[PDB]
Design a protein around this nucleic acid. Structure first.
Ligand SMILES: [Zn+2]
Lengths: 120, 56, 255, 259
RNA sequence: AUUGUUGAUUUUGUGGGUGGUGGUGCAU
């Protein structure tokens, strides 16, 4: 089980329980309110300001929130569930997500423990 | 439309320190993260529609 | 009757006066309340109280999030019986036949008549080619028998639904396709008559489908060509005329 | 206990809302959603006493501004109750034109509507007239395919009652691209009324609306079911088929291709 | 996208099914 594969299930479980803040504005709002448990940020964001702000908020001394890097924004959006399912079953019309923040894990899964263990 | 409007609310220094450039609404339901629109003569909340004075 | 009527008119105006007064008092209450808006909100905020879903409610929120993972089935319409389809087809045939008879007898659709026209007459990946030359460049390197394939692909790649503006692009392509049908006939083809016969009629069959939706674009190109044949005839006489014109006049009868 | 001055302030509002028909609403009223204790502020305004006109305007204001969990409370405690009482107390058992619009606006937030309006209604002795009126709102207004599919799967799982079958028939008429999971759930519902060990539903007399709903499923989702799923339904129409609808259901099922 | 700040509920292009909180009588 790779780290990337672990996040596939972890984010999906959060979606099922409405525990994800999808997008920059929701992610920034969630971080400032202290409801963020994990941050997944895209490394390939064209605007350096987006990376700088989220990293600063995630590293706030009052509320330190773990941060993860993902290569592609389009690939993150599929985890966030933005895209739709085609007849073949492949994701279609997927929408990129620069940032995704988890507010509630919903269910305790071994993959969640694996993600936490790396950060500790 | 305004593009990447959230970025304008925050300024981050070279040291990574994040400073808020806009005030938050004090309404308990709005809570933290709800930012008052800065007008010339007033501060306006887009959520609860409250109005606050600029130098209050 | 008259006294009953003045009673009814008087009764109506008397209520109409009451409603306007009642409306006026209500607006006065709202204005006074709005003036006291700041005062009331103050203490109300001061008294703002300090800081589980039903298991049925959980299931619904759970359920919606699985359904998006699932694939979606295509809905279908009720099947008409063969009798209903035949009756509908027969009904359409009757209407079209009647319209043709009406037009044959002078009914002009804008339903005027021929006599109306006689006033003042005597007294006075895949690229969609907007021009015919563009189509040839795309099909320059292909065999003759492969023209229907690209022409059909250009239609498929640019259906109206895929993007806005595709109706106009296919509208121009209908004109461009017609200039191709006549263009190929001009070109020498005795070597491969069988191959030419396979492409030329296939293109005409395609052109017929376009005309059903884009007759207006086709009509404009048709009238321009008739002007072009006339103009070339004025200077060259028969030397202007070619096999393409004979083919052209035939396609118009089809469409 | 609200501030005593506030009580007069909103009691005055309550009088205004009773007769309100047009114009601008009270400004104290338009800020109720932003209040945390709106359940207490809303009480002094006498929601049961609102004019039908205010109910529509409150639905615009409260649904759009409150959160999804809270809007469910508004739709359930206020909009649903006014919907039921209005049908019962009207001479012709119809619904007022403005209460009718409020349900449509409450459908703007499908999650709150289904859990606040629809499911409580069918689980609290909905009658045929209420199902028809609420079915019409659901038929006319656009709803997301995802929420309806969860909702459609929900009603099929409840005990059989004609009022519930009205909503089942409506949700099938909508011609949504129902996900395969929901299509299966529809198959099980119709399958469970076939006599085999089975419940009373096998022998329960079936009104016409059950057969119209089963014809609606056949007309639209015949091409969406497996061959196995096809034969069970074909068995069902053989045993529980109607005199006139049954043959039409059979014609549609045989004409479909397996997925 | 869009609501009035909000978050995919809408908007846009192309097709397209619908008379239906419709009446009025008849048959437990
Ligand atoms: Zn506020």
């Amino acid at each position: 089980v790779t780290i990337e594969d672990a996040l596939k299930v972890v984010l999906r479980t959060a979606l099922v329980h409405d525990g994800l803040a999808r997008g920059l504005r929701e992610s920034t709002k969630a971080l400032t309110r202290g409801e963020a448990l994990l941050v997944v940020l895209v490394s390939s964001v064209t605007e350096a300001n987006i990376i700088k702000l989220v990293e600063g908020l995630a590293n706030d001394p009052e509320n330190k929130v773990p941060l993860i890097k993902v290569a592609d924004a389009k690939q993150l959006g599929e985890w966030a569930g933005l895209g739709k399912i085609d007849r073949e079953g492949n994701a279609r019309k997927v929408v990129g997500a620069s940032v995704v923040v988890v507010k509630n894990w919903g269910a305790e899964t071994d993959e969640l423990s694996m993600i936490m263990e790396h950060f500790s | 439309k305004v593009k990447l409007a959230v970025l304008s609310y925050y300024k981050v220094d070279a040291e990574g320190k994040v400073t808020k450039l806009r005030r938050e609404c004090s309404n308990p339901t709005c809570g933290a993260g709800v930012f008052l629109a800065n007008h010339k003569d007033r501060l306006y909340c887009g959520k609860c529609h409250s109005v606050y004075k600029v130098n209050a | 009757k008259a006294e009953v009527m003045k009673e009814v008119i008087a009764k109506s105006k008397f209520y109409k006066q009451e409603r306007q007064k009642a409306q006026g008092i209500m607006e006065d209450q709202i204005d006074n309340l709005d003036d006291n808006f700041e005062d009331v909100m103050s203490e109300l905020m001061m008294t703002q109280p300090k800081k589980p879903k039903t298991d049925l409610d959980k299931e619904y929120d759970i359920k919606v999030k699985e359904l998006q993972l699932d694939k979606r089935a295509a809905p279908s319409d009720r099947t008409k019986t063969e009798e209903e389809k035949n009756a509908e087809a027969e009904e359409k045939k009757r209407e079209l036949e009647q319209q043709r008879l009406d037009r044959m007898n002078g009914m002009i659709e804008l339903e005027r008549g021929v006599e109306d026209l006689d006033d003042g007459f005597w007294e006075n990946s895949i690229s969609c080619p907007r021009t015919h030359d563009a189509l040839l460049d795309q099909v320059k390197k292909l065999d003759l028998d492969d023209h229907p394939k690209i022409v059909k692909n250009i239609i498929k790649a640019y259906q109206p639904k895929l993007a806005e503006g595709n109706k106009e692009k296919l509208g121009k392509f209908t004109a461009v396709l017609l200039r191709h049908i006549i263009f190929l006939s001009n070109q020498n083809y005795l070597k491969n008559v069988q191959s030419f016969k396979r492409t030329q009629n296939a293109l005409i069959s395609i052109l017929k489908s376009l005309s059903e939706k884009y007759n207006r674009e086709l009509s404009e190109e048709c009238r321009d060509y008739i002007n072009e044949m006339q103009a070339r005839y004025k200077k060259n006489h028969f030397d202007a005329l070619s096999n393409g014109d004979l083919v052209f006049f035939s396609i118009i009868g089809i469409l | 206990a609200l501030p005593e001055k506030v009580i007069k302030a909103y009691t005055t509002v309550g009088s205004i809302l009773k007769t309100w028909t047009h114009g601008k609403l009270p400004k104290l009223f338009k800020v109720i959603p932003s209040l945390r204790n709106w359940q207490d502020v809303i009480y002094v305004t006498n929601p049961e006493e609102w004019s039908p006109h205010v109910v529509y305007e409150a639905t615009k204001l409260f649904v759009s501004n409150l959160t999804a969990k809270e809007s469910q409370k508004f739709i359930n405690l206020i909009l649903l109750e006014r919907f039921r009482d209005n049908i019962e107390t009207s001479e012709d058992h119809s619904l007022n034109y403005h209460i009718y619009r409020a349900v449509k606006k409450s459908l703007y937030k499908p999650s709150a509507f289904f859990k606040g309006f629809l499911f409580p209604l069918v689980e609290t002795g909905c009658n045929v007239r209420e199902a028809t009126i609420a079915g019409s709102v659901l038929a006319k207004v656009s709803v997301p395919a995802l929420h309806s599919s969860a909702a459609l799967s929900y009603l099929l799982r409840l005990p059989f009652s004609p009022p519930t079958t009205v909503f089942i028939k409506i949700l099938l008429d909508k011609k949504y691209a129902l996900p395969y999971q929901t299509v299966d759930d529809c198959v099980y519902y119709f399958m469970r009324f076939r006599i085999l060990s089975n419940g009373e539903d096998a022998t329960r007399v079936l009104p016409v609306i059950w057969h119209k709903a089963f014809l609606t499923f056949a007309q639209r989702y015949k091409n969406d079911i497996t061959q196995d799923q096809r034969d069970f339904l074909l068995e069902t129409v053989r045993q529980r088929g109607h005199k006139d609808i049954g043959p039409e259901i059979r014609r549609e099922l045989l004409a479909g291709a397996s997925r």
